[PDB]
Design a protein around this ligand. Structure first.
Ligand code: SF4
Lengths: 49, 303, 51
């Protein structure tokens, strides 16, 4: 979660389609953050195991 | 200066749109050796402004089609890089899907190119009558091939069954009347058979005199109609040897058609309901489908 | 072998094998296929022969 995921994201950082060139989707940096629960309406909350 | 040589060759190609041989270039420019001319031609071919043709007289060098322009918006490169295989297809046409696949371009670009070419009267789109899936694109100057589109029977991508039925009926009536006149003549069996025979040109001229439809019917159209009549088991065709005459269609051969009666009357099997039953396989003595409670034989005996 | 194939008949008629204009589309090559062509052995051999 600290090193390998960044390498995987870097290996597939750019994705583009053949049709309509000059269009692309570039990933910059990925984060995993702290565990949270999606119970609250569009709001996160810390949750214990 | 090889640049001057290339410019002179380009000017000579402009002077002769059909292409120039090496002899013409040598006569126009004799002071230059053959090796320099070959290097100049190789450079012209490498930069893509010339095309090579192999005719019975040798090699021809033609300027690439750039003056003929229909899609000038954007780049002439893609315009010619579509018109190339457009012309290569030519009379047979080519669907938009195949154009896209051969051009390796998205659908939007090729759609724009085709629209712009149609705007300046360079390509015509006609509906494929063989398979009505997409519109094929052909050169505006080229005449459409009868196989890929059009035809004397097809009218707006619709097969005219009534037209071919009327043609068959009229041809069969004419042949039957001719055979009846030949039989009533009773002058001589050979003469009777020769008079019962009708040439393809004769029946074609007869159909033209009738004038059932507005579309012009060629001789081979009437020939195919008579062949379909032969396949119906109603007429007979014989190929006789005739060098030249009023037909002159086939070299030394003429097709004569005559109305002939069938070999035997309808057989006895078809006179029974069992012979024309569609569920004949499921017939059984004891079951739902039995000859005792058959509806076909019931209606047949009641009739 | 090609000469023997052509020599099947003693006298060969002038063939009407005029080279129809088979100018192929310079299709825009996909970047993956372009990389494959660059990494091809024939391309490397041609680049070596260019010197
Ligand atoms: S349904 Fe009757 S008529 Fe038809 S095949 Fe069977 S037995 Fe024969």
């Amino acid at each position: 979660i600290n090193v390998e995921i960044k390498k995987i994201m870097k290996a597939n950082e750019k994705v583009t389609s053949d049709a309509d060139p000059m269009w692309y989707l570039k990933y910059l940096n990925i984060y995993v953050g702290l565990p949270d629960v999606e119970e609250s309406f569009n709001v996160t909350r810390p949750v214990s195991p | 200066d090889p640049v001057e040589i290339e410019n002179r060759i380009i000017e000579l190609c402009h002077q002769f749109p059909h292409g120039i041989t090496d002899q013409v270039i040598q006569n126009e420019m004799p002071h230059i050796e053959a090796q320099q001319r070959a290097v100049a031609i190789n450079r012209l071919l490498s930069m893509g402004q010339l095309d090579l043709l192999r005719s019975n007289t040798g090699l021809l060098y033609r300027i690439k089609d750039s003056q003929n322009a229909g899609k000038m918006k954007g780049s002439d490169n893609q315009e010619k890089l579509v018109y190339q295989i457009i012309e290569d297809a030519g009379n047979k046409g080519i669907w938009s899907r195949d154009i896209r696949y051969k051009s390796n371009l998205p659908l939007t670009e090729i759609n724009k190119i085709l629209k712009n070419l149609e705007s300046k009267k360079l390509i015509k789109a006609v509906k494929s009558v063989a398979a009505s899936k997409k519109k094929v694109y052909m050169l505006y100057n080229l005449q459409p091939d009868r196989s890929v589109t059009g035809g004397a029977w097809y009218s707006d991508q619709d097969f005219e069954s009534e037209f071919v039925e009327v043609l068959n009926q009229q041809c069969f009536k004419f042949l039957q009347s001719k055979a009846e006149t030949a039989r009533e003549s009773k002058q001589n069996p050979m003469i009777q058979r020769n008079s019962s025979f009708a040439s393809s040109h004769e029946v074609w001229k007869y159909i033209c005199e009738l004038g059932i439809s507005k579309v012009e019917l060629s001789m081979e159209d009437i020939e195919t109609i008579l062949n379909t009549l032969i396949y119906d088991g109603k007429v007979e065709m014989t190929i006789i040897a005739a060098k030249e005459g009023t037909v002159g269609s086939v070299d030394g051969h003429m097709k004569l058609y005559r109305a002939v009666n069938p070999i035997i009357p309808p057989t006895g099997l078809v006179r029974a309901p069992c012979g024309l039953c569609p569920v004949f396989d499921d017939c059984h003595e004891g079951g739902e489908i039995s000859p005792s409670n058959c509806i076909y034989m019931t209606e047949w005996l009641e009739f | 072998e090609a000469a023997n194939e052509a020599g099947d008949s003693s006298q060969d008629e002038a063939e009407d094998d005029v080279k129809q204009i088979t100018v192929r589309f310079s299709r825009p090559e996909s970047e993956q296929a372009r990389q494959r062509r660059v990494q091809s052995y024939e391309f490397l051999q041609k680049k070596h022969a260019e010197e």
